[PDB]
Amino acid sequence: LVHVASVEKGRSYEDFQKVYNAIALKLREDDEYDNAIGYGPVLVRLAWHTSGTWDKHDNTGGSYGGTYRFKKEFNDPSNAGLQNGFKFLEPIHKEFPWISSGDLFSLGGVTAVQEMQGPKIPWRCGRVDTPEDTTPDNGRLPDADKDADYVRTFFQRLNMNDREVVALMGAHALGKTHLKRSGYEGPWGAANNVFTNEFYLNLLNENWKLEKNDANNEQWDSKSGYMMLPTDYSLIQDPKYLSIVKEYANDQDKFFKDFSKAFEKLLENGITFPKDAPSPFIFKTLEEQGL
Ligand code: HEM
Ligand SMILES: N=NC(=O)c1ccncc1
C-alpha cells in the first residue's frame, strides 16, 4: 500500500499551531483527570497506539488512516483506557473539523510531550482518513509480560533498532499503569506529567522486587511505590539494551534528541511525503508564546 501525504486544503503552519494551542490550553484546563496527572500521558499513549499498528512488510496499520475512530480498533483490548484521549480530542476536532483524524491523534502526542517540558518533536501534516475496511485487526500492539528477545523482535516490525526501542520506552516516565485497564498497577516514577529521563534513572537506581499484582500478573516493584513491566525490566537484563539505558540515564540532552527522532519516525511510518510537501513544523509551546 502507498499512502501519500496530502496537506489539508490551504492549511499552513499557522493553522496547525492553532490546533496545537487548543490542545495545549485544554491540557492546562482539564487538570483533574486521573488523580491530577492530567491528559498528557494518555495523549502520548494514544499517538503511540494509533501509530504502532504499522507493519513495514505491507504498510498496513500506521498513523495515516486515523482508523482508531472505528469500532474494531477502539475496542482493541490493547487500547483499553485510550477512549479518555479520544474524548479529550473530541472538542478539538469539533472546533477544527478540517484536520484529519491521523493528524489529530499524532499532533495530540506531540503537543502533550512538548507541553510536559519534553523535547521539540517536528511534526508533518497530511495524513488522510481511510475507510473502515482499512482498520488493522487487533493484536498488533506489544505484550507486556515478555522478555528482551520479544521486545527486539516486536519492534523490528516498526523498523526500530535497539537505540530507537530504548529511547521510545522512556515515554514510561509519563502516567501510570491502571489495574482495570491493563492488569498492571502503578507509576514508573514520581513526576508523572513531566517529560524527563526518570525512567532510566529509576530502572538503574531503584531496588526492584519481582511481585504479583492483584490481577495475578508479575511486575517489578520498588519501595518508592514505582513499578516496571517485565518488558521495561528486560532493558536492563539484555546487555545491549543495558548500555543504552545507562547512556540515557546519564545524558538528558541525548535522550531528548533521540526520543524526538524516534517518536517522529514512529508517527510518520508508512507515509510517503511528496518532494514538494512542506517541511516539518516545530510548534511553539504555550509558554514560548506567553499564552
Ligand atoms: C514493549 C513495548 C510497550 C509495552 C509492552 C507497553 C505497555 C504499556 C502498558 C501495559 C501500559 C499501561 C496501560 C494502562 O493500564 O493504563 C502503558 C502505558 C503507557 N505507555 Fe507503554 N508500552 C510499550 C511502549 C510504549 C511506547 C513506545 C510509548 C510511547 C513512546 C509508550 C507510552 C505510554 C504512556 C505515556 C503510558 C501511560 C498512559 C496513561 O497514563 O494513561 N509505551 N504501556
Ligand atoms: N503497548 N502495549 C500495551 O499497552 C499493553 C500491553 C499489555 N496489556 C495491555 C496493553
Strand partners, 222: 208
Closest CA to 155 of 169, 145, 137, 174: 169
**Grid coordinates of 40:** 498528557
Question: Between vectors from CA 142 to CA 243 and to CA 248, what angle results, nearest 5°?
Answer: 25
- Ligand 2 atom 3, closest CA: 78
Quote the ligand 2 centre to 51 CA distance (angstroms): 14
- CA dist 77 and 256 (Å) reads 31
CATH no., domain 1-141+263-291: 1.10.520.10
Q: Is 14 exposed, middle or buried (0-12, 13-18, 19+ CB in 10 A)?
A: exposed
- CA dist 199 and 207 (Å) reads 14
Helices (H), the chain: 13-29, 33-36, 40-51, 71-74, 83-95, 101-115, 148-156, 162-169, 179-182, 198-205, 230-237, 239-249, 252-268, 286-289
Which residues are marked as active site? 49, 188
Ligand nearest to the CA of 77: 2
Residues sharing a CB contact under 8 Å with residue 29, sequence separation 6 or more, in sequence order: none
- Residues comprising the binding site for heme b? 172
- CA dist 178 and 184 (Å) reads 6
Quote the ligand 1 centre to 11 CA distance (angstroms): 32
Contact predicate 281/123, CB 8 Å: yes
Closest CA to 48 of 262, 285, 251: 262
Please choose from 51, 54, 143 the residue to mutate so as to test ligand 2's pocket, defined by most ligand atoms within 8 A of CB.
143
Contact predicate 67/73, CB 8 Å: yes
Q: Is 210 left (phi over 0), alpha (psi -120 to 50) or beta?
A: beta
CB burial of 65-100 (b: ≥16 within 10 Å; e: otherwise) equals bbbbbbeebeebebbebbebbbebbeebbeebeebb
The total of other beta-carbon atoms located within 10 Å of residue 165's CB is: 21
Contact predicate 218/128, CB 8 Å: no
Contact predicate 47/149, CB 8 Å: no
The total of other beta-carbon atoms located within 10 Å of residue 186's CB is: 17
Closest CA to 92 of 78, 111, 113: 111
Q: Which helix (H) or strand (E) holds 138?
A: none
Ligand 1 and 45: CB distance under 6 A: yes
Atom of ligand 1 nearest to the CA of 47: 29
- CA dist 17 and 111 (Å) reads 10
Q: What is the DSSP string of 52-115?
A: TT-BTTTTBSSSTT-GGGSHHHHT-GGGTTTHHHHHHHHHHHHH-TTS-HHHHHHHHHHHHHHH
Ligand 1 and 175: CB distance under 6 A: yes
CATH no., domain 142-262: 1.10.420.10
Closest CA to 101 of 78, 72, 121, 126: 126
Contact predicate 281/20, CB 8 Å: no
Distances from the Cα of 82 to the Cαs of 46, 181, 262, in angstroms? 6, 9, 22
Closest CA to 263 of 117, 115, 109: 109
Pocket of ligand 2 (CB under 6 A): 78, 141-144, 182
Residue ranges covered by each domain of the chain: 1-141+263-291, 142-262
Give the technique used to solve this structure: X-ray
- CA dist 57 and 38 (Å) reads 36
